[PDB]
Each structure stands twice: as C-alpha cells, then as structure tokens.
Paper text:
Tryptophan-2,3-dioxygenase (TDO2) and indoleamine-2,3-dioxygenase (IDO1) are structurally distinct heme enzymes that catalyze the conversion of L-tryptophan to N-formyl-kynurenine, and play important roles in metabolism, inflammation, and tumor immune surveillance. Tryptophan-2,3-dioxygenase (TDO2) and indoleamine-2,3-dioxygenase 1 (IDO1) catalyze the same reaction: the conversion of L-tryptophan (Trp) to N-formyl-kynurenine (NFK). Both enzymes evolved to bind heme for substrate binding and catalysis but are structurally distinct: IDO1 is monomeric, while TDO2 is tetrameric with two independent TDO2 molecules contributing to each of its four active sites. The enzymes can adopt an inactive, heme-free (apo) state or an active, heme-containing (holo) state, with the balance between them varying dynamically according to biological conditions. While apo-TDO2 is catalytically inactive, the term “apo-TDO2 inhibitor” is used to describe compounds that bind to apo-TDO2, compete with heme binding and thus prevent the formation of enzymatically active holo-TDO2.
The 2.61 Å resolution structure of Cpd-2 in complex with apo-TDO2 revealed the inhibitor bound to the active site (including the heme binding pocket) of all four TDO2 molecules of the homo-tetramer. Cpd-2 is a mixture of two diastereomers, of which only ethyl (R)-9-(3-(2-isopropylphenyl)-1-((S)-1-phenylethyl)ureido)-2-methoxy-4-oxo-6,7,8,9-tetrahydro-4H-pyrido[1,2-a]pyrimidine-3-carboxylate was observed in the co-crystal structure. Cpd-2 occupies both the heme and substrate binding pockets of the active site and, in keeping with its potent inhibition of TDO2 activity in the cellular assay, forms multiple binding interactions with TDO2. Both benzyl rings of the inhibitor are bound in hydrophobic pockets formed by phenylalanine, leucine and tryptophan side chains. The benzyl rings are bridged by a central urea linker that forms hydrogen bonds with the side chains of His328 and His76 (both are key residues for holo-TDO2 activity, with His328 anchoring the heme via its iron atom and His76 binding the substrate Trp). The backbone nitrogen of Ser155 forms an additional bifurcated hydrogen bond interaction with the inhibitor. The larger fused ring substituent of the inhibitor binds between loop 145–155 and His328 and may serve to stabilize the loop conformation and shield the hydrogen bond between the inhibitor and His328 from competing water molecules. Residues Phe72, His76 and His328 are shifted away from the inhibitor by 1.0-1.5 Å, together with the neighboring residues of the associated alpha-helices. The shortest distance between the His76 and His328 side chain atoms is 4.0 Å in apo-TDO2 and 6.9 Å in the Cpd-2 / apo-TDO2 complex. AMT was also observed in the structure of Cpd-2 bound to apo-TDO2, with an identical binding mode.
Residue numbers in the entry:
A (entry chain A): 40 to 168, 187 to 243, 248 to 338, 358 to 394
B (entry chain D): 40 to 147, 153 to 168, 187 to 337, 358 to 394
C (entry chain B): 40 to 168, 187 to 338, 357 to 394
D (entry chain C): 40 to 148, 152 to 168, 187 to 337, 357 to 394
The structure:
C-alpha cells in the first residue's frame, strides 16, 4: 500500500481553502486557523469512535462478561489522553495575535453561526443535558451516563437479602455517631457539638431517598438512588479484587468530566480573546468522593461468606 | 459560510478507510493509527506553510527591511510551538499496546511532507516536489547569507573580528602570567592544562583555514563570515539592532532541539511497534565559547550609530 | 563545593514532617501533599525573584535605556514558562484520590485557615486589586501594572506637538466612518441595506467611544479599567506600529503581560477545581486594557501612515 | 496548624544562598539554577517515597494478598506522572541562555545527586555512603518483581502447564506455515516468504531455549529469570482474564517508568551538553515479550469449568 493512499491524504491534504485568498487578499495566519480546527475535528472523530465502542460494550451486554473491563477502562483512559492533547493544542492558537485575526476576521461571516456537529454529538453521547438526523440519534440513543447507571444498579453487594450494603452502612453510621456524641459529651466542648451536629446532618442525608429524588428533578443529581449506592460500594471496597478495575472506570469517568470542563474553559477564553469579551455528567461520582466517613465504620466483609468480592463473572 | 464547508469536513472527516475492515475483520485500534497520522500530516503542512513563508521573506529580500523581523521570529516561534505539540502527540500512540497493533499489523511507508520539511530547513509528481525542495534555497542558506551582512563586521568600520582577536590575545596573555605566578602546587599544575586547552579552543575561532576544512568534512555548515555575524549578534544581543535577531538565532536552535527530540521519540515508537543532524550546529557551537564579558569590545554611541539605528 | 551544601539540602530535604505520622497513624499520600506544596512554594519564590527584578528595572529607571528590553521581555517569558509548569503540576495532585485524602484530612485542622503568603505577595506585586510587614510592603510599593502604566505614558509618537497619534487616529476614524455611511446610504433600499445600517451604527458607537476620555475615567472608577487614558494610548501606539523596530520588543512585552494574566487565571481555575475536588463543592485580569485594545475593529488602511524622512523615532533607539 | 509551619517553609524558603552573591557579585540567573535543582530533589524524594513503599509491599509479602494490587499499580503510575513533570521541568532551564550561565559558571568549580543514584539503584539499574551501600545491597524493584512473576498462576506443569501447551501450539502452527509456504508456486513472493518464515521461526522457537536465556542473562542482555519471563508472558496473553487485568497494568507501569527514565536521561544529557559545551532499561524483558509475533489463535484456550484460577483471587 502507498502511505498517502492508506491515509487518504488526497482528501485530507487538499481541504485547506483560505477564505481570504478566495474572497480577496490572502492572510497568512488564516492557514493556521483552518489546520487547527481540522486537527480538533480529527480528534473529535476519534473521541466519538472510542466513546461509541465503549457505549456498545455496555448496551449490547458485553460489560457483564468482566473480561472486557480492561478494554473499557483502557479506552476511557485513551479518551482522556486525547482530551489532554486537545487542551495543549490551544497553545498553537495563542501564537496568532488578536491583531492578526482581525485581518481575516471579515471573511468569516457571523461568528455566532459556526457550531461543531461532532462536539455536540460528543456532549450528547456522554450525557451532557442530514446532520440533524445524526443529532436526533445522539439525543435519543442511550448516553454513556445512562449505560453506566444501569451497570451501577447491578453492583454486587447491594441486594438486601444478601450483603445489604446500604442497610449495614446506615446502621454503622448511626451506631458510630452515637459513640461520637458520647465521646464529645464526656469552649472546646461547645464548639465540637456544632462540628458534630453538622457532620451528622450531612452523613444521614445520604440515606434520604426523597431528597435524592428532589435533587434529580432540580438537575443537581444524574444517577438513580440505586446507581448511587453501587458507585459508593465500588468506592469503599475498591481494594477488593472485583472492584479494582471498576474503581478505575469511575475514576476515568470523573477524569473525562474534569478534562471536558478544562477544555471548555480554554475554549471560552480563546473565544473571548479573539472576538472580544454544571456541565459535569458524573457529578454524583464527584459528590460520593466527598463523604467524610471513617474507614473503621465501613461494613466489614467475611471472605468465608462473601465470595463475590474475589470471584469474577462472565 | 457553513463551518463544515469552510473546513472542507466532507474531505477531512470522510478519509478514514480502515484496511482491516476492508480486507476482512475490523480492528478497533486501526482508527487511532489512521487519525494520529492524519493529525501529524496536517501539522507538517502547517510547519511547511510557516517555513516557506519565512524562506520567502529572506529569499525575496524583504528581510532587509527590518520591520519584518517580528514576523520572522514570531513564525519561527510558532513552528517550535507546533513541534512541541507533535512531541506530545506520541503519548496517543502509546495508548495502543504492541499486542493490539499485531492484530492489524498483517493488513499494513515514508512521509513526503516530513522529507520536504527536512530538505527545506537544510538537513543534509510527488518526486517533482522533492526535487524542488533539494534544489531550492534552504532556511540555513538563506540565514547564512543574511548573517554575512551583519553590521559591525566591516574591517574599515567597527572591525569586530580584529578588536575581538586582539582582546582575546591580550586577555589570554594576562591569564598565562596570572597562572605562572601562582605557587607550584596541585592547583597550579592542573590550571596550566585547563589554560592550554581553553587557549587552543579560543584561538581556533580565528583560524579561517580550519573552519573551511571543517566545512568540507561536514562538521560546519555556516560560512566563516556568517559565523562572525552570528557571534556579533550573540555578544551585542542587548543592543537594540540585535535584540530581535538574537531571538531568531535562539528560535533556529530551538527548532533543531525539537526536531531532534521528535526524531528521538519517533525512533522509540518505531522500535516499540516493530520490535549531528543539527542544521544550526554553528549556533550551538558559538553559544559554547568561554569568553569573559570584560573582553568583549566596547561600543561608543557617539560613533557606532548602527547599534541603535534600524534600516529599511 | 559539595552539591548538597550548595543547594542547602540539609534544610530542603529535612522539612517533610507528616502530620498524620506525628498526631497518630501515618498516611502515605500525605507525603505527596507536602512535597507538591513545597514545590509550588519554591516556584512562587522564583516568580517573585523574576517579578521584583523586572519591577526594579522599571522603578529605578533602567527601562529608559532600551538595551534592557531584551532582559525585561526574557524574564517575563520565564515567568510564563514557570506558570505553565505550575498548571501542569496539578496532574500530580490528581494522582491522589479524594478517598485517600479523607484519611489524612482530619490532621489538617480547618482548611479555611491556610493561605499562601508568597501567592498573595505575587498577586499584590503584579497589581491584582513579620510576615504582615512583607504583605504591607507588597500592597504599598509600586505594582508591575503601575510601573508599566508610567512607561506606557512616555511612548514615542503620542506628543500632540509631534506625531500626535491620537489626533491623527481620531481624524482618520471619523473621516473613514463618514465614507462608510455614504457608501451604505448609496446602496439600494433592501434587506441587506436595512441591516448594514445597524451593523454600522454599532461599529461607529464602539470606535468613537475610544476617544471619550470622560467614559474611560468613569470605567476606571467602576473598576472596568486599570490603565490611565494616556497609558491606553501608548499601548495602542505599540499595537498598531508593532512592526516598527522601536516597538517590536515592547510589543512582545505587552504580549508577555497578557500571557501572564491568562496563565494566572488558568492556574486559579485549576486551583479552585482541585480545592472543590478535595474538600467537596476578567476580574483578576490586571492587564484587561491590553486584552481590550487587541479587540478594536479598525481597518489597517485607516492607521495613520508614517514618513521615514520625518519620523526617525520609529527606527532610532534611545539610552 | 499554620500553613508555613506545616510545610516547614522556614527551612524550604530559607535555603537559597547564591554562590555568586556570596563570593562577589550577584548573578540573577543563579537563583533559577538553585530553585530548579531544589524542585528536582523534592520530586526525587517523592519518587523514592513511592518506590520504597511499593518495594516494601513486595518484600514483606503483602503483594500476595491481591487486595494491594490497586495500591501498587496506582503508586507506580504516580511515579511516571512525577517523571513526566520532571521531563517538562527542563523547559525552565532552557529559559537560562548559555551566555548567562557563563556569568555564574566561575563560582561553580563535579556534582552528583545522591537521591538520583539511590533511585537508579532501588529500581535495579546495573553517612551518605551508608545510604548508598544499603540501596546497592537491598532488594531492587526488579528482583522483587522477578520473584512475584515466578509465582504467576498457570505456569505449574502439573496444572495449566502454559509453557508446554504454548510450545506445542507454536510448533504445530509453524509446521502449518511451512506447508502453506512450500505449496505456493515458485515466485518472487514465495522466495521472499521462506526467508521471512525462517527468521520468524528461529525467533519464536528461541523463546523455549532455556540454556540461551541463561547465557544471555550472564552477558547482561537479560534481567529476569526464565520462570519470571514465563509468568510475564502469561500475564500478557491472558491480560483480559480478571486475575491478570491489574497485574498487566503493573507490567505496563514498569515499562512506562523505563521509557520515562530514558527520556529524562536523554533530556539531561542534552542540557548538560548545552550548558557545559536498551542498556539502562531494567525491564528490557517486559519490552521484549511485547515484541513476540504470535497469532491469537495459537494462544492456549482456557476452560472456565476447570481453570478457576483465572477468575478467582487469593489473599
Ligand atoms: C462549545 C462547542 O463550540 C462550538 O460548537 C462552537 C464553534 O464550533 C465550531 N465555533 C465557534 N464557537 C462555538 O461555540 C463560539 C464562537 C467562535 C467559533 N469558533 C470556535 O470557537 N472555534 C474553536 C476554537 C478553539 C478550539 C475549538 C474550536 C471549535 C472546534 C469548537 C470558530 C469557528 C471561530 C472563531 C472566531 C471567529 C469565527 C469562528
Ligand atoms: C523520519 C521520517 O519518517 C518516515 O518518513 C517514516 C514513515 O513515514 C510515514 N513511516 C514509518 N517510518 C518512517 O521512517 C519508519 C517505519 C514505521 C513507519 N510509520 C511511522 O513511523 N509513522 C509515524 C509514527 C509516529 C510519528 C510519526 C509517524 C510518521 C508520520 C513519520 C508508520 C507509517 C507505520 C508504523 C508501523 C507499521 C507500519 C507503518
Ligand atoms: C488563591 C491562593 O490560595 C491560597 O492562598 C490558599 C491556600 O494557601 C496555601 N490553601 C488553601 N486554599 C487557598 O485558597 C483554599 C483551601 C485549601 C488550601 N490548600 C490549597 O489550596 N493548596 C494548594 C493546592 C493546589 C495548588 C496550590 C495550593 C496552594 C499552594 C495555594 C491546601 C493548603 C489544603 C487543601 C486541603 C485541605 C487543607 C489544606
Ligand atoms: C545522572 C545523574 O546526574 C548526576 O548525578 C549529576 C549531577 O548531579 C546533581 N550534576 C551534574 N551532572 C550529573 O551527572 C553532570 C554535570 C552537570 C551537573 N548538573 C546537572 O546535571 N544538574 C541537573 C540538570 C538538569 C536536571 C537535573 C540535574 C541534576 C538534579 C541531576 C548541575 C549540578 C551543574 C550544571 C552545570 C555546571 C555545574 C553543575
Ligand atoms: C456480572 C456484572 N458485571 C456484575 C456487575 C454489575 N455492576 C457491577 C459493578 C462492579 C462489579 C461488578 C458489577 C454485571 O451484571 O454486569
Ligand atoms: C539591512 C539588513 N537587515 C542588515 C542586516 C544583515 N544581517 C543582519 C543581522 C542583524 C541585524 C541586521 C542585519 C540587511 O542587509 O538585511
Ligand atoms: C526612552 C524610553 N524607553 C521611551 C519609551 C517610553 N515608553 C515606551 C514604549 C515603547 C518604546 C519606547 C518607550 C523611556 O522614556 O523609557
Ligand atoms: C497469591 C499471589 N498473588 C499469586 C501471584 C504471584 N504472581 C502473580 C502474578 C499475577 C497474578 C497473581 C500472581 C502470590 O503468590 O503472590
């Protein structure tokens, strides 16, 4: 095979038509503007390729066979590696001064008229709240959030008739807080009762299903109450073999959120720089990470009974 | 204008034909392999765009009007910023394990744009483009000609090389006297060797015949007069006329460091999947010349107006 | 000299006292937390070293000798290189999970009680709106913004008796806009003509606002402007004539100043995210005027032309 | 607690004594030189902190309880993340021109980093001297990883017998290839594929020559033992099987650390030459096993009804 024919460089390297050169006088920096956007769109296509493949593994049921956890986590890690390079790619646009941009700015019609289809498809496919047919599919089809929520709802250890994680956790937090109240009641004392009455209210709020449902309606929550429990199960028992790679998956999901927001931040700054001057899908994963529960209150697991913690399924 | 029509996304986003999917069974990682190479080639086209424009400014004589120094230095800096991102772009190929590569390896070269870039900088139908890059004036040759016209070299005027030679000679004689006076010791017996080595190196700078010999052996690239112009820019870099030209010599060295770092990363990735060439060596060499700042010939503002007066 | 003695490694490498190990049981990740903060503080000390030296060059008058422009621009570039590494340094804290942080979180007393003195000194020295004595000096002494403002007020070409840049610019913008109004009113009464009069009446109001000194003074009181009206003109002079030899390196300095603002804000953004991640969840731009002047839609053909036979200042440097 | 007291900023921020300012006239860039080296040394201390903790987990036997695999892999990943930042930290020294360095070069006389040497020794690269003697004598990360690879499940000849099954499959697969090639008509493609086969066969069959591996280990060309080599290759081919997913990430981390240490060494040599005018790869065996052209259909198949070790963890 010929290198250029394999990469279809006759299409890729023949798609740089300068609008300044077309509509009048050529402006040198417009070529940088065109290539940078083409480079972003090539990487958006790759991020969609990796995202749809991971979505397929969940949707078609392959994620149930736990041999595919390495491939899901690996591909989610690749998405964040690509996103890290896209955040670094802003440094190239920084080399184009605002004064030079205003030279070719006239040939770019209204700026509030350009919108990336692939970026919108990517946001929709993750779960952010002819070309229109593709957009209608991205909004209708199962998002990476919905597919991760369904999988979190099936987390081992949640079943009330088995391990009953939420029941044990609630009882342990209640019994642990009673010991704390006793220890405190036995200026420093008057201040520690306020620090306790605040920690108690926060910890017990986790067991209020009606408050979670209210927050889901207000847009402050995305995951269902059962998916929230499955994620918290993976968090506290992350060292247990069955939850080690699933813990890396929850981490990757949060990383992709941090990087998409960091990219969005960089983008807004570049837009405000050239034209003159919430989005976290996995907020629940960030929120569960910020729960002050002592490791000694986490329900202890018996290896003689709870074989699920160290036995994998296909 | 429509965004996708402006970027010609109908060509760009419809050029990913997987050879595994075509010749049999689709291998997922092959899409990453295709996009990464297409991304490199888009940036190679940009580096050639910036390089040819800078080359044009020198070749057509616009570089003589010093208003274009900001544009040359700015564009050379941009090339290094793109090269920095291309070195980082190797991390994406690293996400493809060697074992996954062997799955699509059965269905699988030389980059024309990379070769055109190397040729255009001065590294020692598609073939017509290659023949032009080898024949046309390189960025090194164009920079050499411009360095040959550096103000202050003229023997009838500032005579930089004459003043510098006398100052280095008189300064080294003081050093020999200062060392031979020190008491016979281990420090004195060692500093005579450190002096006889520094003297041989410093005085070699004024041997034009040795420079010409080294140019033939490939050890030097710039002419003896271009070498003097570059060293003039180095020592008088704080003088207004040489501030932006100093940044240009720095950018040229940066591009060499980054091309070599890219080449290093490339070789490692090739050896990972399938189991010197510094154009501006003279700019690196002149940066490593141990000359005390008090030996640099001083310049009088009443006589040497060239140091603070620009030309168009 | 001995390597460790030169770097004072007996002080540097003997300053890692884990509070978890001290007050109870050792938590491994607390060492990463301590070293990362010590690394940030070493770079903050370096940024203050470079910043104070640049501030000294302006304040002591050395910036008047234009041989020091390469050294000012070089050091401002270094500050942004250090800041870029500090933004990348957040990736190391990302390696510490929130769950691991909660293990040593108890030994760190109230978080709303820790404050970096050096970060505050750095913000004050740039111009962001015994240890307290150092802070009092940073707030009282001349900021990098005030020192850059004074230098911008002396930009060649502003003098009304000489080049008179603001006068020429105002006349050219006024005469150019009148031709635009005539060109638009000549076009046949259509949807394109009725829409271009709105695009013109908006561009005219924006362009002519640049010559309203009373509006600039009003915006300076509201905090929307930082530079004086004359410093604003000096910066715009450097912008339009940036290719002229005398303004090439000063243009790079205005660019560095804006870069430092973008990077300080990008660092602040990264910091807030890391704080919200571990403890549960244009104002700070000193050089806003430099960003604003970059966004002024003036056609290059309206920029007052310069005669080399008369305007020798554009290509002749001063000491 | 006070922020500066917690970080001991009275030691950290009061350790910058410029030798140019001390021995005569202050050279501004010397402060950058001192802080950059102090920043490297702070990160070297952190890399040693993470490395010793991982080494302890192996040496004291905690690595046998597989609940600690997340903590080993996580910490090895952290070392690479710090090393990535140290490679980026060279860009700061690049802001100091060679000409500016020669201004303070006279006050610097030869120096050697003890922590860098301790780090190289602790990974397994082939009063302060007491610390160096301990790093050379104590078990390296390579030796501790080798011992753990020697106990990889599936190697046991009485059980799964990975090496036996693999050898038979490679032998039978190569015979099919020889037959398939010799059948092809005498052509330029046929005359070239016999050379490509005789080279691939010699390479693949060399993997089962224990005497050649022992000889290469003595010549320094190999680091891991023959059994550790088999355990690593077992983790490679069965990386998708639950028990080998996290151990595969560990072998990847170990190779990453080698790639990054080499990239750091490259950057260092360039910066040294700029201011003053497979050998070091500890895990060469992990890189070598990654470059073994074996078709996935020749990998011995595993039965879940019999081979419960692939999906059952141990404590
Ligand atoms: C949040 C997803 O962003 C979009 O869908 C989007 C968009 O799509 C191509 N184009 C733009 N905006 C957008 O919100 C804001 C006005 C500016 C415009 N541009 C961008 O930002 N390009 C841009 C810049 C940096 C990084 C990435 C992009 C694109 C790919 C989003 C270019 C097209 C432009 C700049 C200046 C004048 C005229 C056009
Ligand atoms: C010094 C200029 O390099 C070349 O001209 C060149 C080249 O051009 C496209 N392609 C290759 N080599 C080369 O020397 C060496 C063998 C490997 C091959 N590949 C590369 O390296 N791609 C590559 C990798 C990383 C970064 C950049 C490239 C290309 C763009 C040079 C891809 C095509 C490949 C990989 C594996 C199997 C088959 C093909
Ligand atoms: C805008 C300037 O920032 C400060 O002056 C400042 C500060 O100074 C040391 N320390 C903190 N905050 C601050 O606003 C917010 C609460 C958290 C706290 N921490 C930080 O952010 N460290 C931090 C993190 C990343 C990067 C840099 C820093 C410091 C050097 C600012 C550490 C001390 C911490 C974390 C968690 C619990 C307890 C303490
Ligand atoms: C392979 C492990 O390297 C060393 O142990 C080592 C060393 O230790 C501190 N110092 C040096 N060399 C070394 O081989 C080579 C000569 C140069 C010297 N320097 C360095 O490289 N610093 C350096 C530079 C960049 C990154 C890291 C370092 C140190 C921390 C290794 C500084 C001390 C220096 C520069 C110029 C003149 C005098 C001294
Ligand atoms: C067999 C299973 N993979 C079980 C499962 C569901 N959610 C999980 C989270 C972590 C670990 C396992 C699970 C499945 O039902 O998909
Ligand atoms: C007028 C001029 N630009 C002079 C020139 C040549 N080489 C230089 C190096 C540095 C500074 C100036 C020059 C020219 O002849 O091109
Ligand atoms: C001699 C001078 N450096 C002139 C000056 C002031 N501001 C400037 C801006 C750009 C260029 C020059 C200046 C001085 O008075 O400081
Ligand atoms: C119980 C065990 N961790 C078994 C073991 C050894 N090496 C391994 C490699 C991959 C997976 C498991 C192992 C041990 O003996 O340490």
């Amino acid at each position: 095979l010929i290198y250029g024919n394999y990469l279809h460089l006759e299409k890729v390297l023949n798609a740089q038509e300068l609008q300044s050169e077309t509509k009048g006088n050529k402006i040198h920096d417009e070529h940088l503007f065109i290539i940078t956007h083409q480079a972003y769109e090539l990487w958006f296509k790759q991020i969609l390729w990796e995202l749809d493949s991971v979505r397929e593994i969940f949707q078609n049921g392959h994620v149930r066979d736990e041999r595919n956890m390495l491939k899901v986590v690996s591909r989610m890690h690749r998405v964040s590696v690509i996103l890290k390079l896209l955040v670094q790619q802003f440094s190239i646009l920084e080399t184009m001064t605002a004064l030079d941009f205003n030279d070719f700015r006239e040939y770019l019609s209204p700026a509030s008229g350009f919108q990336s289809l692939q970026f919108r498809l990517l946001e929709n496919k993750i779960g952010v709240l002819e070309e229109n047919e593709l957009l209608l599919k991205s909004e209708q089809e199962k998002t990476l959030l919905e597919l991760v929520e369904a999988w979190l709802e099936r987390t081992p250890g949640l079943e009330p008739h088995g391990f009953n994680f939420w029941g044990k956790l609630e009882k342990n937090i209640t019994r642990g807080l009673e010991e704390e109240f006793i220890r405190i009641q036995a200026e420093e004392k008057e201040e520690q009762v306020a620090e306790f009455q605040k920690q108690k209210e926060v910890l017990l709020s986790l067991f209020d299903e009606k408050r979670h449902e209210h927050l889901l309606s207000k847009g402050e929550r995305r995951l269902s109450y059962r998916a929230l429990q499955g994620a918290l199960m993976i968090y506290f028992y992350r060292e247990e073999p069955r939850f080690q790679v699933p813990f890396q998956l929850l981490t990757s999901l949060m990383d992709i959120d941090s990087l998409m927001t960091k990219w969005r931040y960089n983008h807004v700054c570049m837009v405000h720089r050239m034209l003159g001057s919430r989005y976290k899908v996995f907020v629940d994963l960030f929120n569960l990470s910020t729960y002050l529960i002592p490791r000694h209150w986490i329900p202890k697991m018996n290896p003689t009974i709870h074989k699920f913690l160290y036995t994998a399924e296909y």
